[PDB]
């Protein structure tokens, strides 16, 4: 599981990244299911993440995203010339989803403001836990963390 987490750039707690849904990636998520929680983010959550904790990787440097010019200089090759374009590409998986995901630095999230909401985190979400696959509650979890 550690190798899969490293491949997904989940090198520290309260850190997450966008992963394309595929038959191969589903197996990877199942492998690291105990140690991670994932779901189906909505447009609002993706926009909030890209707006607040949106950091881009430029020549091995985690340059914060604060201007459309920054995205255009690096991501303008594929037609992504604004933060809105990046958000649209992330939410709507397209031909250049991989490049956009790689460019974005792994998100650094804090602990939930209202708490995880369960007495024991290390349990399946279907039984009052935290990890697993929470379809829509992932948005609420991220918003509290973000």
């Amino acid at each position: 599981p550690r190798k899969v987490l490293q491949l997904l750039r989940l090198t520290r707690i309260n850190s997450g990244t966008f992963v394309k849904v595929t038959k191969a990636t589903l197996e990877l998520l199942k492998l690291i299911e105990p140690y991670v929680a994932y779901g189906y983010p909505s447009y609002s959550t993706i926009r909030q993440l890209v707006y607040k904790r949106g950091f881009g990787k430029i020549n091995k440097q985690r340059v914060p995203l604060s201007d459309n010019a920054i995205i255009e200089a690096n991501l303008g090759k594929y037609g992504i010339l604004s933060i809105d374009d990046l958000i649209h590409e992330i939410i709507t998986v397209g031909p250049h989803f991989k490049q956009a995901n790689n460019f974005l630095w792994p998100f650094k999230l804090s602990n939930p403001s209202g708490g995880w909401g369960v007495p024991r985190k290390f349990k399946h979400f279907i039984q009052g836990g935290s990890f697993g696959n929470r379809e829509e509650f992932i948005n609420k979890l991220v918003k509290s963390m973000n």
Binding site: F125, I126, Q127, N133, R134, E135, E136, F137
Partner: protein, 170 residues
């Protein structure tokens, strides 16, 4: 707080078998994910369908028809414990099906030590007329002109010291 959900699956229709039996059942759960997981578990146990070849056609929430009408609920429950699995039947006088199933779960976790993991709700039905109830503790509340007091009320104190010597009269 529990909730009632309806889940239907038809095992990913393939060639020569369009629109399979379309198994239908009602699942009580606190969220859609738990309802889907319980539906999958029930399909695996009772039926031969597993999530490998399964498919969730649609999940919907059912609201009680009369949330302000008192009803007597008869519930058939099959649950597993340290011993072998066995059937069980109980009668609950509640207002809504969700409240009745929640009370049943609480009683099972209290008396029989059975929790949501090993409890199955086979069927929930409403008892229409009197004298069909088979439990004395439910018949207790069906008596005409039922009046009783509430002796020894546990009054709450907002301060450590009270210069009154409170009385528990009601």
């Amino acid at each position: 707080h529990f909730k009632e959900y309806q889940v239907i699956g038809r095992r990913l229709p393939t060639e020569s078998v369009p629109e399979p039996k379309l198994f239908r059942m009602r699942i009580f759960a606190s969220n859609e994910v738990i309802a889907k997981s319980r539906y999958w578990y029930f399909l695996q146990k009772l039926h031969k369908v597993k999530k490998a070849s399964g498919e969730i056609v649609s999940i919907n929430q059912i609201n009680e028809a009369h949330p302000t009408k008192v009803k007597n609920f008869g519930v058939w429950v099959r649950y597993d414990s340290r011993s072998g699995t066995h059937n069980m039947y109980k009668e609950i006088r509640d207002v809504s099906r969700v409240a009745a199933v929640e009370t049943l779960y609480q009683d099972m976790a209290a008396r029989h030590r059975a929790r949501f993991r090993s409890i199955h709700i086979l069927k929930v039905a409403e008892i229409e007329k009197t004298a069909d109830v088979k439990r004395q503790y439910v018949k207790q509340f069906l008596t005409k002109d039922l009046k009783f007091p509430l002796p020894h009320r546990v009054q709450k104190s907002t301060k450590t010291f009270s210069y009154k010597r409170p009385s528990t009269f009601y």
